[PDB]
Amino acid sequence: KTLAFLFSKGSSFQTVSALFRENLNKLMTNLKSTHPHFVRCLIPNETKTPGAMEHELVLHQLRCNGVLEGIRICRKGFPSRILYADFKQRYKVLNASAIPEGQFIDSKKASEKLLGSIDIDHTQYKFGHTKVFFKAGLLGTLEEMRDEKLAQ
Amino acid sequence: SMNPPKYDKIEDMAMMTHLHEPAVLYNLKERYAAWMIYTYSGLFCVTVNPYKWLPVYNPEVVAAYRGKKRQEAPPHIFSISDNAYQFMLTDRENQSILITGESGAGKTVNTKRVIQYFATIAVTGDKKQGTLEDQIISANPLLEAFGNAKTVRNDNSSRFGKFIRIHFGATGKLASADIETYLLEKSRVTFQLKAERSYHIFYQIMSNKKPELIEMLLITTNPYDFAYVSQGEITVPSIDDQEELMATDTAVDILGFSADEKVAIYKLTGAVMHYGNMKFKQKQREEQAEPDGTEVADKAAYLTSLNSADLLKALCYPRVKVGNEYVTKGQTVQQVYNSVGALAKSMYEKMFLWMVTRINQQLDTKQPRQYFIGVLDIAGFEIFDFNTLEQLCINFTNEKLQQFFNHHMFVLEQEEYKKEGIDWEFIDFGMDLAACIELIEKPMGIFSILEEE
Amino acid sequence: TTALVCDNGSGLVKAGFAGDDAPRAVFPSIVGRPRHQGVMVGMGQKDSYVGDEAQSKRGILTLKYPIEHGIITNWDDMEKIWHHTFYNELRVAPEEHPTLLTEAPLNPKANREKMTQIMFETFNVPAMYVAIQAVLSLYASGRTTGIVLDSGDGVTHNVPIYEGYALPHAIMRLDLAGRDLTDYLMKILTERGYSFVTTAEREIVRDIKEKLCYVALDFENEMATAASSSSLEKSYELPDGQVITIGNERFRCPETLFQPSFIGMESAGIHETTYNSIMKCDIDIRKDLYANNVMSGGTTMYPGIADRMQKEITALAPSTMKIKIIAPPERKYSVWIGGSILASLSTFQQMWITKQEYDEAGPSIVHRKCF
Amino acid sequence: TTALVCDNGSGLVKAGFAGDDAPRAVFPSIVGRPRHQGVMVGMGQKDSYVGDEAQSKRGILTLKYPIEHGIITNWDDMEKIWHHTFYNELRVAPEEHPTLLTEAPLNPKANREKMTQIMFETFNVPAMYVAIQAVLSLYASGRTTGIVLDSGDGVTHNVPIYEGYALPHAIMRLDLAGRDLTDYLMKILTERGYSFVTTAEREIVRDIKEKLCYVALDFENEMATAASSSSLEKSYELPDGQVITIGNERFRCPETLFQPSFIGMESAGIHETTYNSIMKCDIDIRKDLYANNVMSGGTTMYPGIADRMQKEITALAPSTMKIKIIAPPERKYSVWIGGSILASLSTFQQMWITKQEYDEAGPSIVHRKCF
């Protein structure tokens, strides 16, 4: 009298790995309804210890943990949004230009002028409606400019 | 040349500004030497077992605020829950939160703490019987033995599929939860290498301590006997299965479910390992595989409350036909051997499946559910120098999960293009890597053609 | 979606999806019609009847038999049968699956061309195939080489198959199947002279062929026992009515296979045909076939055939070399089972006919495209 | 690293590293392909087959034979064979070793030029050499002077070699090898008239050539015994199937070597060719060769050849002077063994072709550079 629950068309004696697909498949289907959320988790250490990093498996785990090639994927995006006010609060320097704050210049305008000195591009940058968008390299070069110019 | 101190102190891998792996890695290592816990990419947080005391838990942050959407607050897994709630609260369709690798201590500890934060959600919702984490703990030790496995590179690691669900008739204090039934790896019963060991239940029970069962089991305390069992490594030196037996007792008694059934139940597994002994023989002028007449079969008969001859005739040359009814005879040695292994495996499977019914019912409540939040343990991929198909298949499933990750991000990011006025110059990541799976999958499956052929 | 196979190996007709162990149900391919004025006005008149429905209804119905000698006699009748089978048993629509067809080998093109023409036009069906019996017989029996004997309801076969290839010259094909034997039976039976001739009366014999037959071990010696004993003689009822009791008339029947004098022909019989067809085929292979010898379906059901066959081969073989035969339990189903296997493998996706070709070229497509 | 040698002396093909005593394994250089529609759809179709794999598979395969008369017939087929041999037996990559090639002497340049061209281009291989059979035969037999007879699968040879030098004018080269003899065998065999002609059927004879042959001591006297006795006659099975029993038809076969009437040619035979080729060569040396007389490979396997050869030379020699012949056990392997020795000595490092030359000049390099 285990046996009733022991006991109880798609296939018979067959399809076996595909059955294992099927088992996943239903799950995947139902998950499609959902919003998923995400955590990826690591032993950085040789061990579970206060003792320090062991790198290489952490490398490969991160290879196994999508963020790495996810970020590969995303860099094509120029996957990047940086806010007007801070950004310009750094960046105005090369324009050496006074036109009043507020919307005499947008950030967009101030860009178009500084870019007019510096760059015309889509790929290195494009405008966003409130925040600003870049090739990874670009912020890097931006502040490279900033230290170089301010030091001189 | 590398993203400078501005980048260097940021919260986010997510907001990268230079892409080569070492950047990410060292920087998070800088968090680590800062001990700075919570790390972000995708839109989501990435986790390390700190291996030390810290009162991360202490409610000053945890209770006092819900907190904030991502940019707005210090990184914390508490966030992900928090905002998933308020998201669902308005949205009112379900969400699960997905937690990868980490296959031993921190994985489980943090899952615990996840439900702890579920308790914090309960406290947020309302406030005025195992504790609900402790209720999951009720499952944990037995289930942990139950589907843990040993990797060459991991020592208690579990190759069931479990999925964890939590269910709301309530948006009050908290409402009750499921843990659920997902891909299970039958083939492990088929095979081990001599370095490697078996579904832990077996290894655990088969230790010596419980004096009555071993003969009640119709078993020798020797693993060595059961070649189908024996295939593995003969011990793990210092995982102490006498006490682990005692823990199994502790849980099964905590079941509040009957001794007689549960003993018969693991005894089923005993029968299963007895089946490894069953071995058939092929006669002159004849192809059939044919019996060793064996106390093993008599043990089976006893435990089953079948008779052995019933096995001998009715299985060992089967009958199937309906509309008239007709008989099946002469199986090959391989046919027999495979067949019986299949049966045994399916039976183990079934037994797991049964565990659902009552275990959950102990969990299960006439408190309603409208809506659902969920937990998963593993997108499990690991490497060995040497490989076997099933593992690769699970890896396939892992990348499939990554399809799911990618195309959701694809959609959402396109929404972010919309957000500040901008037009998509990028195509489905879900599709793009799905093509890589598609090499594995056509209406022809790779797996499909293998098993097919 | 999913894939479905018709067996039209004659006798009861077998149909089932890929991967089921056995077809859902099975039907004789009897067709029958009324014989008498319909005199219950309350009755609905249906003018044609098929299947176990008819098998019940038989008495005033009279039978037509839509396959002679494995050749299907009358197409529209088939279409009736076929339609019925889909809708009544299968609850299936022609679009639903690829469909696989089961053929006597080496027989006139017409069956190919009309069968395909009808089933693509009258039914409209994703993919079509027609396959030769022996291939299935090997796949089910799972030995890539072999020779098969399967003498069904219909025309009776020898094919050696070597692994992965056909020897169509090698092949022998015979109209000796059990039906005609049974009709000879009556010309036996009048000796005891309980005697009846009509189609249904003829099918009544089929039961006796199930129950009462067994294979002669040795003909002379059997006659000697026939003189000695009545244990050779067994007592059997009419399906309803009398008890009937039958002598050598049981065992004499199968010998026709070994000696088709009794309804008289020359082809030197199953076994001598087989060894002949061997001696056609080349020298080295032969041992394998001496090892791998395979039999199936309607006649083979009889207990003992394999034994006297082996006796015969030991006569004809040089005794020096190993001999055995295979006699699986399930032979009568074997074909459709093999068909299921045949259905399973993705390669037919490469291989099926599609509607498109039938659009772009005729029935002619088949005869290149299939064997 | 280490150095590897292919034997492409025809018949089974022999390959092995320097310093192993015997090649790792050996393959016929049969090539064969399907003959029949492939009718197990489950089967993978491979369209070409070689080696013992084919030797098993033969029956539906049909053979091509890529070397006639020691001349290799079809290059791409060779390339198939060659590739297979490396990867399947040898688990070897073309870079791995110098490689040494084994050649019929005095035969058309083309084999040199394409062989080298392919193997430097298609394979890419540190060092290449092609060497004439007799040289190896001496090295293995270890007498610096000599004359060699080795009639393999392929074209049949006389070379006197004196110590350290060639006499290319002296040399005689004949297409009389055992294969063609065997095909004559069938024209014998129809006398008893158990009769079969195809390639595999022809190779079946090879076994009989192993087992059943022996050399006529005296032809007339043998005929007299043939009239007297049946001990001359022995009983042998088909590889499977019948027992077969064979008369003078065994011993008559080798006589063809002495009398190539039976498949009819004029060259006055092995022995008379040899003495002819001697009488070409100069006067003083001759005694040494009368002493040093050496034989190998396929035909020589037969028991007794050396004896009747000596009888023949005692006919043709002035009896006054010593005569003997060498008949080593290992002759069929001899060539590759000698090749191993040839591989051993560092001087080929001076001597190998290198890729560089093949870069800087054509196949033409060989014909200066090698013999």
Ligand SMILES: Nc1ncnc2c1ncn2[C@@H]1O[C@H](COP(=O)(O)OP(=O)(O)O)[C@@H](O)[C@H]1O
């Ligand atoms: N129980 C039985 N014993 C012996 N013969 C039978 C039995 N049942 C059916 N048969 C015979 O087997 C055949 C069934 O048709 P089948 O073998 O499928 O022919 P086909 O090879 O054309 O498909 C018929 O000849 C039928 O009379």
Ligand SMILES: Nc1ncnc2c1ncn2[C@@H]1O[C@H](COP(=O)(O)OP(=O)(O)O)[C@@H](O)[C@H]1O
């Ligand atoms: N056991 C045997 N007895 C006599 N002849 C044999 C035997 N085995 C092989 N041979 C013959 O010897 C030859 C083998 O080829 P081989 O002598 O290597 O030729 P090649 O000189 O071209 O390398 C073939 O003619 C084959 O038929």
